[PDB]
Amino acid sequence: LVCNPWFEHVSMLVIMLNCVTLGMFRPCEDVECGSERCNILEAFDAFIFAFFAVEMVIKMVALGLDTWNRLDFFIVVAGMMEYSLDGHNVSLSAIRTVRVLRPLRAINRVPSMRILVTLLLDTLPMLGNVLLLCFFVFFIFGIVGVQLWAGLLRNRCFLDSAFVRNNNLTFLRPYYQTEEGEENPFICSSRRDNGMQKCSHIPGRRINWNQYYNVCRSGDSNPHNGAINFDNIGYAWIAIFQVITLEGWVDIMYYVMDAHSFYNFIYFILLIIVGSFFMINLCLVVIATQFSETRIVDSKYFSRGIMMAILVNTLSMGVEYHEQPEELTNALEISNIVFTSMFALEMLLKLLACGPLGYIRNPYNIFDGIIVVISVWEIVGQSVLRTFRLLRVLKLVRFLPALRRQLVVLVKTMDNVATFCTLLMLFIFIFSILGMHLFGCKFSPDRKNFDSLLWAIVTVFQILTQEDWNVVLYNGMASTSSWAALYFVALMTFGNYVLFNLLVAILVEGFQARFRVSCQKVITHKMFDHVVLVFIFLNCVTIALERPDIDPGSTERVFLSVSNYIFTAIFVAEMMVKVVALGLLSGEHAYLQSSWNLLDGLLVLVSLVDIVVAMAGAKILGVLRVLRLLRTLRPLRVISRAPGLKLVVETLISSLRPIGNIVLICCAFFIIFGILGVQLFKGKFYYCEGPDTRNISTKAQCRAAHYRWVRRKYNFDNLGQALMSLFVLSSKDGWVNIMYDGLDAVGVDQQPVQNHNPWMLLYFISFLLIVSFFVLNMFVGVVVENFHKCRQHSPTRRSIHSLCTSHYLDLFITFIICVNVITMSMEHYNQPKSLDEALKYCNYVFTIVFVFEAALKLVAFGFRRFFKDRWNQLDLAIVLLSLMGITLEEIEMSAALPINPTIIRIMRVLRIARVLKLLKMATGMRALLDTVVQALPQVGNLGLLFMLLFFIYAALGVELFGRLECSEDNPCEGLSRHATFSNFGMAFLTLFRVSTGDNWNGIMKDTLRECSREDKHCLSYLPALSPVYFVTFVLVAQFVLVNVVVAVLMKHLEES
């Protein structure tokens, strides 16, 4: 019965039959239970439960009263409760949700999955230290947010009560709201605050009703049907968790910048660093560390000749585009006819030399044979085979040993990854059917729905990639309840911060197992670099003041022009003195013998050319524009002057070498999928744009209806457009909307139809899975190389003293503070007055209790001894700060009111420093923080290179996108009043958003859109520089952040 192993196979057979039974559920076709298909299914489910109950009885009898065994016991108990409770209509369907745990049974039946889960479950206990840090991040930022912005997102511009009453008119809506409605609320800034958005910014009517919305008072709803707000701690954590995932965090920021203050970006800049970057990357480091702790034919020319033929053929296949000329299509076919013949000529020649058996011996020779038959078949059969012509690129593996070796390493990576991927699909499946039960046809139908298995799986995969996952969250919260946020918190946490970090650990552990003399003296002088470095810094301020809105006649323009001449002369002399002392190139130690010296050569040379062009009253405007762009690279001279920056930059360029092949393999897949995407989707990404297009089906109908026939910014018309669309997909920002266009595509001059070709999911989801696999191997290749580089390198007083030295006092304080944390979290918007008095009294008790501790501490140790320890100093500061806070509150209560109410609010917010005391108790967390501290010297410079990169691109963006404008005639999808390149300060903040990858694809769209005919000073070739601007910044910015994660990882490994 149980002894025979075949019984386990019988159980595994039933398990799979239960998973298919769960997947056939239809949310609101089975709830009624009026169909015959459901009746057979529920009977099938009942039969399966009988088997499980029968088996469990047998096992219990055989074995009596193994964690997995307990789990199976839990499922049987839960199922019996659901099964036996039938006949009671009270929450019967709700109890039905417990069956989604049945697929978990398969973990124990598969030995490989059981081992991995066991290893995973033995790694969790040491993640607690990172969990304690998460509590601090959420509690600290969740109580400060509530204190500042409680109820400020309910603000709306209302009509004056007297106006409506006296004038006896009630046709207008009570408060201003765009025609879009509550989906885009117009939040105003209260009169006592200084928010950016005021009720006087309301656009006029388009005699004017809008101008009378001139009162900003609290409304009756928060943004997104109440989902986004800071009215209490519960609603604040939903916002904070959304910021930590870097999805929609700008929208939350803009909501408080428009209502409270523009300087609220500090609150979100810190949170993206402390929480989104370090806290989410400390979890990765901990898991990885813990896992580690647990005759003619053979001629060279012939091979080169055949290699060249394949390469030229591949280049030819990528020259197709929409509206292709007939002649170019004919030429391509002839070229295909010749090339396939050439391979066939090679196919015959090798056969003769080695014979039919000899040729079959070589494995590559076998593959070539499979390609010739289909190639000739296509000509003889004179379109599906056309898509197979891309396989010819695989022939090049024969003649690239370096890549051939690299591919083998990647292929051998699948043996270890196979067990995990099987664990991913089970994790996704359980949450796919769990989503159906909760959100089954409640989203009234949105494309992101849980209405069926196919589109519930896609909505769970999409959430894990964190693309529009908040849009799904808002619908889920509104439909069922605000507590539906727990579904997304668990899916995003167990999926992205535990399972994904486990995959990285699997990979890492797998791999891991006379005047000239004066110049000679002056340049060699110690302070020469610091003197020049000062001039360069002043040159950065001049660059940072440049912006489009400078009046040419103003004094500031004159000042900027003069300073430019001064710096150009200064750096010419510095270059001139160096060359004289060292010689241009003839000497062995010549000036141009080092790349850094060469770098300074081009920058100076451009400056002289700039002077000449400025000297020239001629048609040289185009040249003057290019020069203006290159003059933003001047800050690059800081690297050669700072020894720390020079070292790290040379290190980063070193880290690229080990992963060079993977980049080449990754660049090869971009072209192959780009060429494939062009063939499938060229000419089909057009749509009819208009208020109502339900009747439109073709281009002509779009013209007849006087609607516009337009094109998507990201399409696959040609390999140039395909590569720009694929990079956006790989970045996983806006990748969903490109997928929708692929599914909806119908044909040339045809209106796309929703979900026309669902089979296209394979093209897009396959690309994301493959590209994410290569990106993982770039991170591992950097780590493995770094590890290699690292391994090679009085009686009344005595009792008081006993109490203070005893742990009792410390644990008592930790209890008092833990109570304080609870009370501080009880505050919310419009709390009852009785609560205000109760919380005020609770503050009094804490204040005196802290005071007593300081009094006892002073007596036990003495005034000089007590002040020695920094922890005691922190107590003194907070107790002193607490006394100031409470003092001003009472004066505010008193008749005298000289205290500005900003002071009171700031003091209340700052009283959260009491939590820092718990830091002393958390020895584990402090050691974890100590790891980052020890790595600061290696991370501090990478932060200097990060800000230097930001400066060069923030100054470059202003020159490029300085003048772009947003208007109802030329609307912008990513830019707004908050995201602009108007000046250096704003471009710096926009680039910070781009680094996080929050709707950076929308910003790029706004630069690719054509300038208006009437508008002037629009760069013709901007749509070509914009993709280069965003691609390079995105890749360069992320590489620096990757190395900062690795630097902390190495330090952690070497400390344990």
Ligand X SMILES: CC(C)CCC[C@@H](C)[C@H]1CC[C@H]2[C@@H]3CC=C4C[C@@H](OC(=O)CCC(=O)O)CC[C@]4(C)[C@H]3CC[C@]12C
Ligand Y SMILES: CCCCCCCCCCCCCCCCCCOC[C@@H](O)COP(=O)(O)OCC[N+](C)(C)C
Ligand Z SMILES: C[C@@H](NC(=O)Cc1ccc(C2CC2)cc1)c1ccc(OCC(F)(F)F)cn1
Ligand U SMILES: CC(=O)N[C@@H]1[C@@H](O)[C@H](O)[C@@H](CO)O[C@H]1O
For ligand U, the binding residues (CB under 6 A) are 160, 162-163, 212, 214-215, 695
**CA–CA distance from 263 to each of 147, 197, 525 (Å)?**
16, 13, 44
Phi, psi for 440 (deg, rounded to 5) = -75, 105
- Tell me: does residue 719 bind ligand X (CB under 6 A): yes
DSSP of 60-95:
HHHH---HHHHHHHHHHHHHHHHHHTTT--TTHHHH
- Tell me: does residue 135 bind ligand JL3 (CB under 6 A): yes
- Tell me: does residue 757 bind ligand JL3 (CB under 6 A): yes
Element (H, E) at 128: helix 128-149
Q: Is 600 known to sit in a ligand binding site?
A: no
- Tell me: does residue 995 bind ligand Z (CB under 6 A): yes
DSSP state of 383: -
- Tell me: does residue 104 bind ligand Z (CB under 6 A): no
- Tell me: does residue 667 bind ligand JL3 (CB under 6 A): yes
- Tell me: does residue 775 bind ligand Z (CB under 6 A): yes
Q: Is 437 known to sit in a ligand binding site?
A: no
Residues of this chain, 1003-1022, that bind ligand X according to CB under 6 A: 1020-1021
- Tell me: does residue 731 bind ligand Z (CB under 6 A): no
- Tell me: does residue 576 bind ligand Y (CB under 6 A): no
From the list ligand U, ligand JL3, ligand Z, none, partner contacted by residue 234 (C-beta under 5 to 8 A by kind): ligand JL3
**Shortest CB 991 distance to ligand Y, Å:** 8
**Shortest CB 999 distance to Ca ion, Å:** 5
From the list ligand JL3, ligand Z, ligand X, none, partner contacted by residue 210 (C-beta under 5 to 8 A by kind): none
Q: Which is nearer to ligand Y, 476 or 997 (CB)?
A: 997
Residues of this chain, 102-131, that bind ligand Y according to CB under 6 A: none
Residue pair 395/308 in contact by the 8 Å Cβ criterion: no
Distance CA(723)–CA(418), nearest Å, equals 30
Single residue of 403, 471, 676, 705 touching ligand JL3 by CB under 6 A: 676
- Tell me: does residue 1028 bind ligand X (CB under 6 A): yes
Q: Which of 123, 124, 132 is nearest to 921 (CA)?
A: 132
- Tell me: does residue 277 bind ligand Z (CB under 6 A): yes
Residues that bind Ca ion (CB under 5 A): 733
Q: Is 1015 known to sit in a ligand binding site?
A: no
Q: Which is nearer to ligand JL3, 13 or 370 (CB)?
A: 370
Q: Which of 268, 133, 87 is nearest to 978 (CA)?
A: 268
Residues of this chain, 958-1017, that bind ligand Y according to CB under 6 A: 983, 985-986, 988-989, 992
Q: Which is nearer to ligand Z, 246 or 252 (CB)?
A: 246
Q: Which is nearer to ligand JL3, 157 or 473 (CB)?
A: 473
Q: Which of 904, 882, 878, 902 is nearest to 893 (CA)?
A: 904
> By 3-state DSSP, what share of the chain in percent is helix, strand and coil, each rounded to 5?
75, 0, 25
Single residue of 670, 774, 946, 950 touching ligand X by CB under 6 A: 670
DSSP state of 698: B
**Shortest CB 245 distance to ligand Z, Å:** 10
- Tell me: does residue 720 bind ligand X (CB under 6 A): yes
Distance CA(200)–CA(704), nearest Å, equals 41
Please count the CA atoms within 13 angstroms of the CA of 843 that sit on its side-chain side.
21
Residue pair 226/241 in contact by the 8 Å Cβ criterion: no
Distance CA(595)–CA(646), nearest Å, equals 12
DSSP of 456-469:
HHHHHHHHHHTSSH
Please count the CA atoms within 13 angstroms of the CA of 266 that sit on its side-chain side.
5
**CA–CA distance from 961 to each of 332, 975, 988, 989 (Å)?**
40, 11, 13, 14
Task: Kindly indicate which of the ranges 226-234, 260-268, 530-538, 605-613 contains the residues binding ligand JL3, using the contact rule CB under 6 A.
Answer: 226-234
Number of C-beta neighbours around residue 418 at 10 A: 11
From the list ligand JL3, ligand X, ligand Y, none, partner contacted by residue 186 (C-beta under 5 to 8 A by kind): none
- Tell me: does residue 835 bind ligand X (CB under 6 A): no
**Shortest CB 997 distance to Ca ion, Å:** 7
**Shortest CB 729 distance to Ca ion, Å:** 12
Distance CA(725)–CA(315), nearest Å, equals 20
Q: Which is nearer to ligand U, 20 or 162 (CB)?
A: 162
From the list Ca ion, ligand X, ligand JL3, none, partner contacted by residue 826 (C-beta under 5 to 8 A by kind): ligand X
Task: Kindly indicate which of the ranges 285-293, 323-331, 760-768, 986-994 contains the residues binding ligand JL3, using the contact rule CB under 6 A.
Answer: 760-768
From the list Ca ion, ligand Z, ligand JL3, none, partner contacted by residue 648 (C-beta under 5 to 8 A by kind): none
Single residue of 11, 69, 210, 232 touching ligand JL3 by CB under 6 A: 232
The type of residue at 443 is F
- Tell me: does residue 924 bind ligand X (CB under 6 A): no
Residue pair 158/187 in contact by the 8 Å Cβ criterion: no
Element (H, E) at 156: strand 155-159
Q: Which is nearer to ligand Z, 41 or 782 (CB)?
A: 782
Distance CA(377)–CA(1030), nearest Å, equals 44
DSSP state of 278: I
Instruction: Lay out the site mask for ligand JL3 across 600-639 (x = CB under 6 A, - = otherwise).
Output: ----------------------------------------
Contacts of 258 (CB under 8 A, 6+ apart): 187, 188, 189, 195, 196, 197
Distance CA(410)–CA(424), nearest Å, equals 20
Residue pair 776/507 in contact by the 8 Å Cβ criterion: yes
Contacts of 181 (CB under 8 A, 6+ apart): none
**CA–CA distance from 26 to each of 16, 20, 432, 456 (Å)?**
19, 13, 12, 11
- Tell me: does residue 259 bind ligand Y (CB under 6 A): no
**Shortest CB 609 distance to ligand JL3, Å:** 28
Contacts of the segment 1036-1039: beta carbons below 8 A, 24+ positions apart: 1036/949, 1037/946, 1037/949, 1037/994, 1037/995, 1038/995, 1039/652
Task: Kindly indicate which of the ranges 635-643, 745-753, 931-939, 983-991 contains the residues binding ligand X, using the contact rule CB under 6 A.
Answer: 983-991
Nearest 10 degrees: Cα torsion 862, 864, 866, 867: 160
The type of residue at 77 is V
How far is C-alpha 285 from the geometric centre of its chain's CA atoms? 18
- Tell me: does residue 775 bind ligand JL3 (CB under 6 A): yes
Angle at the Cα of 283 (from 102 to 735), degrees rounded to 5? 70
The type of residue at 694 is R
Q: Which is nearer to ligand Z, 341 or 496 (CB)?
A: 496
Q: Which is nearer to ligand Z, 724 or 1047 (CB)?
A: 1047
How far is C-alpha 893 from the geometric centre of its chain's CA atoms? 47
Contacts of 316 (CB under 8 A, 6+ apart): 332, 335, 336, 339
From the list ligand Y, ligand U, Ca ion, none, partner contacted by residue 695 (C-beta under 5 to 8 A by kind): ligand U
From the list ligand X, Ca ion, ligand Y, none, partner contacted by residue 544 (C-beta under 5 to 8 A by kind): ligand X
- Tell me: does residue 153 bind ligand X (CB under 6 A): no
| Binding region | 45, 86, 88
Residues that bind ligand JL3 (CB under 6 A): 135, 138, 232-235, 237-238, 241, 280-281, 384, 387-388, 390-391, 438, 480-487, 489-490, 656, 663, 666-667, 676, 730-731, 747, 757, 759-760, 762-763, 766, 775, 778, 997, 1034-1036, 1038-1039, 1042
Residues that bind ligand Z (CB under 6 A): 246, 272-273, 276-277, 281, 504, 775-776, 779, 992, 995-996, 1038, 1041-1042, 1045
Residues that bind ligand Y (CB under 6 A): 262, 269, 983, 985-986, 988-989, 992
| Binding region for Zn(2+) | 45, 86, 88
Residues that bind ligand X (CB under 6 A): 226, 232-234, 315, 318-319, 321, 540-541, 544-545, 547, 549, 667, 670-671, 718-720, 723-724, 727, 822, 825-826, 828, 983-985, 1020-1021, 1023-1024, 1027-1028, 1031
